[PDB]
């Protein structure tokens, strides 16, 4: 395939990518008449500055620019399709022509590519460029409306799907999502690409290149390089990296960081220096060539090029500089055995990571205080709840909006948009928890990073479970699987283990799911209810956790801790003590994370000795009177 052909080249030599097409377009000094080009004279809107319409009105100029770049030494050239979406063309009144413009640009690039390939004998590739558009999914258009968005996930998916269909019908060899200001836009583009690849089209290699705004080291949406890499890696890009808006000297640390975190190839095409007072770029071809040569001799990059300010002279110098340099060898494993999550910053859970606290208070179904805030429309206080949760030690936030009086997807969308507007909250990953899959989809379409989807199960059969898991995998998030099947909730050791094993083998064998993205919920259930049928639930969970951890490789264990102590409502001290004892024993058994009250978990050794003994008796069922003795202890505090 094309991926194998490109991979075989990337292990032998460093490739050179296109250059600055717009810079060469500006030197042509075209005007409105040239842009309109015999087909759009009577167009109702001005077309000057629309470089993408030049593939139909002035194809010769684009073709000669492509020829110049290919003869300079570029192995890959990008199509003139930076703004060739219906959304980006709406400003020019050409939103209906996106498919045709993409087809024409792909054809005009391909003609030059084949001509130069025949002339020189070196095969050259065409990359289909998908621009970031002027709309941001993760950033509000206006400051005073933080949860407001002027575009949705599905609209961007539709536009990107139309553009990519036009590019694939035109015959591009690579699909390149580049100049990514917003990672959510990149995820929408990847979603559209997956739709096209699963419906009709054979897959093509995908290149993903983000953009770092300045020395702060973050994208325009506020995400770091590692967080960006984690967020977009579910699309399995052949090459990843950064492009443009910075010079080589400033891009060196960030490109090095991105190189150390991914197993894919690293692509880097920065600006030709800084723009001067007049918008011109000062870096000469020799300085850019020596900077990228310093990049190559250090084993940092696999593909090089240039953004604005780059000319065929720059590309010629770069190609001659990196001709004999050894390509970067990607690491075989990047954080092996770790589960990767993201907010604005990466969150990784490894073998030596401590217990991960998932804040529980942002739960409409569970927390009545949070529900009362949500129904009244007071999302500002609901956001302060999450702020206090994170300030108190929560490493992941659980978000739930389940109620019969609420429309769940809209509330989830609003709350996720509001969370994304707060940097202190947006830096941690989110856990989308709901019994309705529509709310889960609404949450997944509103999150920039990589999240956790809580509690899909085999309750409604195998095919429904596989469909939901496939959708979750396409969105690229981790997910939790409850021990729930067609026979009901699993309440016993062997039933929990059987359901979890059956779910694990379905996801791995029949879906190719990443074992490090799989989390199991053996259903922590309430004890001390006064019913003998419920006396072994905690022991069952603790034993099943150990068996699952020692049997199913890569999987992790979670659960809702507060459900264990439901029979002792109002007795917060006893609930906290039982939570501490159960957490001690479960973490010793192999529990990795849980939805807990983050700041209210006592350490085992400073629990009161009498209360510790009572909680140990109740959890391990050492005393038939254990619940009665605990209630007597509660009563005798006055």
């Amino acid at each position: 395939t094309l991926r194998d052909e490109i991979n075989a080249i990337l292990q032998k030599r460093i490739m050179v990518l296109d250059g600055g097409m717009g810079t060469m377009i500006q030197r042509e000094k075209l005007n409105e008449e040239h842009f309109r080009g015999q087909e759009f004279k009577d167009h109702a809107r001005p077309l000057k500055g629309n470089n993408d319409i030049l593939s139909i009105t002035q194809p010769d100029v684009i073709y000669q620019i492509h020829k110049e770049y290919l003869l300079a030494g570029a192995d890959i050239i990008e199509t003139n399709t930076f703004s060739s979406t219906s959304i980006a063309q709406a400003d020019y009144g050409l939103e209906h022509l996106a498919y045709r413009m993409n087809m024409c640009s792909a054809g005009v690039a391909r003609k030059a590519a084949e001509e130069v390939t025949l002339q020189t004998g070196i095969k050259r590739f065409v990359a289909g460029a998908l621009g970031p558009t002027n709309k941001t999914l993760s950033v509000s258009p206006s400051v005073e409306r933080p949860d407001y968005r002027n575009i949705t996930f599905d609209e961007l998916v539709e536009a990107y799907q139309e553009q990519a269909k036009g590019l694939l019908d035109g015959g591009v060899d690579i699909l390149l999502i580049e100049t990514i200001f917003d990672t959510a836009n990149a995820k929408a583009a990847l979603f559209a690409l997956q739709n096209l690849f699963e419906e009709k089209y054979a897959p093509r290699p995908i290149f993903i290149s983000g953009t770092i705004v300045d020395k702060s080291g973050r994208t325009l949406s506020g995400q770091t390089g590692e967080g960006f890499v984690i967020s977009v890696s579910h699309g399995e890009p052949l090459c990843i990296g950064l492009n443009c808006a910075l010079g080589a000297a400033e891009m060196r640390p960030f490109i090095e960081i991105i190189g150390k975190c991914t197993t894919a190839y690293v692509l880097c095409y920065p600006n030709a220096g800084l723009p001067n007072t007049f918008g011109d770029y000062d870096e000469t071809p020799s300085m850019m060539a020596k900077h990228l040569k310093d990049f190559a001799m250090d084993g940092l990059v696999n593909i090089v090029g240039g953004c604005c300010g780059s000319t065929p002279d720059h590309i010629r110098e770069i190609a001659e500089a990196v001709k004999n340099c050894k390509p970067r060898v990607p690491p075989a494993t990047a954080f092996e055995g770790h589960m990767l999550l993201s907010g604005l910053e990466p969150f990784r859970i490894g073998p030596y990571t401590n217990f991960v606290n998932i804040g529980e208070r942002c739960n409409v179904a569970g927390s009545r205080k949070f529900a009362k805030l949500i129904m009244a429309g007071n999302y500002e206080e609901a956001l302060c709840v999450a702020k206090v949760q994170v300030e108190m030690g929560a490493q992941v936030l659980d978000v739930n909006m389940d109620d019969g009086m609420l429309d769940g997807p809209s509330a989830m969308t609003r709350f996720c948009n509001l969370i994304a507007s707060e940097p202190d909250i947006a830096k941690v990953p989110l856990c989308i928890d709901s019994s309705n899959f529509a709310v889960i989809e609404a949450g997944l379409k509103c999150c920039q990073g990589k999240c956790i989807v809580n509690s899909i199960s085999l309750k409604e059969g195998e095919d429904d479970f596989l469909e939901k898991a496939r959708k979750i995998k396409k969105y690229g998030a981790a997910m939790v699987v409850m021990a729930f099947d067609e026979e009901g909730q699993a309440t016993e050791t062997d039933t929990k283990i059987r359901v979890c094993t059956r779910a694990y083998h379905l996801l791995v064998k029949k879906l190719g799911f990443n074992p490090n993205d799989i989390i199991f919920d053996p259903n922590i259930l309430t004890i001390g209810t006064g019913m003998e049928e419920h006396n072994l639930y905690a022991i069952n969970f603790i034993h099943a956790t150990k068996v699952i951890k020692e049997t199913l490789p890569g999987a992790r264990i979670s659960g809702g801790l507060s459900n264990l102590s439901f029979s002792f409502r109002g007795m917060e001290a006893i609930r906290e003590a039982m939570h501490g004892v159960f957490l001690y024993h479960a973490i010793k058994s192999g529990m990795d994370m849980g939805i807990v009250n983050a700041g209210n978990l006592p350490v085992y050794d400073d629990i009161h000795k009498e209360l510790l003994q009572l909680c140990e008796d109740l959890i391990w069922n050492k005393d038939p009177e254990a619940t009665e003795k605990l209630l007597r202890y509660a009563q005798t505090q006055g």
Side-chain angles (χ1 to χ4, degrees), residues 64-115:
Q64 309 276 27
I65 292 165
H66 280 141
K67 269 196 59 172
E68 286 179 50
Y69 271 116
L70 285 173
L71 291 174
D75 300 278
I76 310 140
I77 47 163
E78 297 168 28
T79 55
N80 188 36
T81 49
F82 183 76
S83 304
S84 287
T85 44
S86 60
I87 306 159
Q89 290 297 311
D91 304 274
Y92 300 103
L94 304 169
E95 58 267 34
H96 51 284
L97 285 201
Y99 178 84
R100 187 178 167 222
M101 308 183 327
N102 282 288
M103 266 261 279
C104 294
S105 299
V108 77
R110 176 142 299 293
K111 152 189 201 233
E114 322 278 62
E115 163 200 20

Side-chain angles (χ1 to χ4, degrees), residues 247-304:
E250 340 169 23
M251 224 192 240
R252 192 190 231 275
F254 314 122
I255 207 66
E256 188 176 347
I257 297 162
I258 275 183
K260 286 177 225 233
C261 62
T262 189
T263 75
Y265 295 110
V266 169
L267 71 85
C268 179
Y269 53 110
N271 279 345
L274 279 291
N276 57 14
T277 51
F278 313 105
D280 194 313
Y281 283 77
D282 196 26
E283 192 152 77
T284 70
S286 59
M287 321 159 24
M288 179 135 192
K290 68 158 147 272
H291 274 140
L292 288 179
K293 189 188 175 69
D294 296 342
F295 278 23
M297 300 164 69
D298 285 4
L300 292 186
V301 291
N302 293 101
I303 309 184
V304 290

Side-chain angles (χ1 to χ4, degrees), residues 7-18:
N7 202 105
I9 308 176
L10 288 172
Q11 331 209 62
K12 281 198 235 333
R13 70 199 179 80
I14 296 170
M15 275 165 123
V16 186
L17 170 61
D18 207 10

